[PDB]
């Protein structure tokens, strides 16, 4: 009944509802103020940082009010791009391991938004049954949302990720009997390499040099297979040079 | 004076394009299914390609008038309701139903006129022509692409017709 007021005092109703922003947006929409409504919903989606369902709703409503506004095509496309970036962020959250979510009894709406590093570690944990390249490439793409504030060193994080990816591979342990080059193709990490090449990443520059490789401890914990570390070196150098 | 058994020999003597044109125009005047089936049997006996005959019958049935649609960015300025020509277009489809290889083309035509009914807001007619369509057609089309001994990319019109068909099936 508060919002049931007539237009004679809709203006003062909006002035009062300035403190009830989660409710005043409906009145703004009903009052044919699309620009103010989009400002409202943009601010609401901005403040939303948790609860998958609430965040997705606020983003969608923000873009809907954006288009409802008579703004010029430039601003329309600008805010469309920003919101698009937002669900591009969200896609990682929808791509979580469903079996892990269910057995842990958590739902995306039922649990707030996590840090990019937290999502990365959830993807990369050995408790994650998914042994596929898609996890790894999604985790790598998540680096783009990690900014200059340095929540975690991107270099060491990438080193950890690539070491974990190599760990899924299989080796003729304690002296091998296979080609490092051809034998690792069926392994996931090489597939990661072709995906990087297809996206445009140069393996010579983005894959650490053998110095730092043997500096990496995860990489130095399986060297008990001579063939393991040998094949590390052979394949990295080979594809690095194919990149150069 | 209508001697079906004698039309075919003389029409065979015409140049093939005009021969098929006037033969199809003739069959457009034949509406008893039994007699028209006998017509198609005599056409295949004498060499007339019943498939293209039914084609030209259907597209002449379509082209005797323009299309039908309604919108706000392409709003027509001439309102018009259901016509007997619409019923004729409804009925012309069985020509394509009759033949072994022609259900794919029949689906294409049925959808390409379905769009006119929906756009001009004749959804009752859309549904009735749908109910006219038999239920084994799509599986038969898949079978046909199987026996034609290549599983390459089915044509874009075929894929679009299948997609639109399932979508409108769910819609109805």
């Amino acid at each position: 009944k508060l919002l049931s007021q007539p237009a004679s005092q809709h203006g003062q109703l909006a002035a009062f509802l300035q403190a009830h922003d989660h409710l005043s947006w409906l009145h703004e929409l009903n009052s044919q103020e699309f620009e103010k409504a989009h400002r409202t919903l943009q601010t609401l989606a901005n403040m939303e940082t948790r609860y998958f369902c609430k965040k997705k709703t606020l983003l969608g409503l923000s873009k809907l009010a954006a288009l409802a506004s008579d703004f010029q095509e430039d601003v329309l496309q600008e805010k469309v791009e920003e919101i698009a970036e937002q669900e591009h962020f969200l896609l990682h959250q929808e791509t979580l391991p469903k079996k892990l979510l269910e057995e842990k009894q958590l739902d995306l709406n039922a649990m707030p938004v996590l840090a990019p590093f937290q999502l990365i570690q959830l993807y990369v944990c050995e408790e994650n049954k998914r042994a596929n390249e898609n996890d790894f490439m999604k985790a790598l793409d998540l680096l783009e949302y990690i900014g200059d504030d340095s929540e975690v060193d991107v270099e060491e994080l990438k080193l950890e990720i690539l070491c974990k990816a190599i760990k899924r591979d299989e080796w003729s342990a304690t002296d091998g009997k296979d080609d490092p080059i051809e034998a690792t193709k069926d392994s996931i990490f090489v597939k990661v390499l072709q995906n990087l090449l297809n996206k445009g990443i140069e393996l010579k520059g983005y894959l650490p040099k053998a110095e730092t490789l043997l500096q990496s401890e995860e990489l130095n914990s399986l060297k008990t297979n001579s063939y393991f570390e040998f094949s590390l070196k052979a394949n990295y150098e080979c594809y690095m040079k194919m990149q150069s | 004076e209508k001697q079906i058994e004698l039309i075919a020999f003389y029409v065979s003597h015409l140049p093939q394009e005009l021969a098929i044109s006037q033969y199809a125009v003739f069959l457009e005047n034949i509406t008893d299914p039994d007699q028209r089936q006998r017509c198609l049997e005599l056409a295949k006996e004498a060499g007339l390609d019943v498939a293209s005959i039914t084609k030209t019958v259907v597209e002449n049935t379509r082209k005797k008038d323009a299309g039908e649609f309604a919108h706000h960015d392409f709003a027509p300025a001439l309102d018009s309701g259901t016509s007997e020509e619409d019923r004729a277009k409804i009925d012309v489809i069985d020509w394509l139903v009759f033949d072994p290889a022609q259900r794919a083309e029949a689906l294409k035509q049925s959808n390409a006129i379905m769009r006119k009914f929906l756009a001009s807001k004749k959804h009752e007619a859309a549904k009735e022509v749908f109910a006219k369509i038999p239920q084994d057609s799509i599986a038969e089309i898949y079978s046909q692409w199987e026996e034609q001994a290549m599983d390459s990319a089915l044509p874009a019109e075929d894929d679009n017709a299948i997609r639109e068909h399932l979508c409108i099936r769910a819609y109805l």
Partner: protein, 114 residues
């Protein structure tokens, strides 16, 4: 079952209604024009129908989730709305939010945000 069928129509496999999965290498302007026309016509109407279904079945939370379903760029339902169409849609959403909001609950989530 009616709700089930409507949602399956909205979100059936390979994406979208009258959103086919094969481009015309033959490039027929007629089919394309009629095709876009049928989308931009039929989509708002069925949208309003399902909104009314959930409006009457009192599950206005689903009326509100229709906003995200439309926002889906996997099917790009936003583009096929003119100003008047989506304004009617947003006022329908206004109505649906209004009833739950009268129940002393913020329209942003199941709980209150203010």
């Amino acid at each position: 079952d009616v709700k089930e069928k409507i949602y399956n129509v909205l979100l059936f496999v390979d994406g979208g209604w009258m959103v086919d999965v094969r481009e015309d290498t033959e490039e027929d302007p007629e089919r394309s024009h009629q095709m876009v026309l049928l989308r931009r016509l039929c989509l708002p109407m069925m949208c309003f129908l399902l909104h009314t279904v959930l409006h009457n079945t009192k599950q206005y939370k689903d009326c509100l989730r229709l906003a995200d379903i439309v926002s889906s760029e996997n099917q790009k339902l936003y583009t096929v709305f003119s100003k008047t169409e989506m304004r009617n849609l947003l006022q329908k959403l206004r109505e649906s939010s209004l009833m739950l909001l009268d129940l002393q609950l913020d329209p942003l989530g199941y709980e209150i945000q203010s």
